[PDB]
């Protein structure tokens, strides 16, 4: 007496609603440094994505944001592989997604981009992977169009194995995180009006 087709279409719609809600939860956990909540919410979002039957531009964007935050959170984990190319480190992966999201390339965007580049290198060096650090530089700063103040300085710092140079002290992991958290706050403002979160906020207001 139910229609199997309408049910399946309804399940695909709910999945998109849950995707949006879980993204919000992922952002808040990230923002608040709630590491275990982040991991659990990540697992949930990962499973829920398999309920989709297609993918809109908004949903791809939403998945990208989740992917971005998980790579960033895993930034110090050189254990983790996020790409088929085994050489791409987590921050490099983050960087690739950051350039994929449909969004304006403004000051904040370029700033986050360069901070990730710097930290992609710094974690390689913190691990004494100086050769990996040079290869990372080449991949992300090798393009003549990928300009940044002190871009040349950064490579010299690497070549001289100067892991604890003042440049890295200043453009630190925590500094990167604060700029990204600032962007996360924006996503939170944008997406807090999506269906599931809005319905739930209403129940409890």
């Amino acid at each position: 007496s139910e229609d199997a087709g309408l049910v399946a279409e309804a399940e695909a719609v709910a999945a998109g609603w849950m995707l949006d809600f879980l993204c919000l939860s992922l952002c808040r956990a990230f923002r608040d440094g709630r590491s275990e909540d982040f991991r659990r919410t990540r697992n949930s979002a990962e499973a829920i994505i398999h309920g989709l039957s297609s993918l809109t531009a908004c949903q791809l964007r939403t998945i990208y944001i989740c992917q971005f935050l998980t790579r960033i959170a895993a930034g110090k984990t050189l254990d983790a592989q996020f790409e088929n190319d085994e050489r791409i480190t987590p921050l490099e992966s983050a960087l690739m997604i950051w350039g994929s999201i449909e969004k304006e390339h403004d000051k904040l965007h370029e700033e986050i981009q360069n901070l990730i580049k710097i930290q992609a290198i710094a974690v390689c060096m913190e691990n004494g992977n100086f050769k990996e650090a040079e290869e990372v530089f080449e991949r992300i700063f090798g393009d003549p169009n990928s300009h940044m103040p002190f871009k040349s300085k950064l490579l010299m710092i690497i070549s001289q194995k100067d892991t604890f140079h003042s440049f890295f002290q200043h453009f630190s992991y925590n500094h990167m995180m604060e700029k990204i958290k600032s962007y996360v706050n924006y996503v939170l403002s944008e997406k807090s009006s999506t269906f599931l979160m809005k319905a739930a906020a209403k129940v409890v207001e």
Binding site: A45, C66, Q67, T70, A74, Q81, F82, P90
Partner: peptide, 7 residues
């Protein structure tokens, strides 16, 4: 690969 990494 989506959100959770290969090792």
């Amino acid at each position: 690969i989506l959100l959770t990494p290969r090792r």
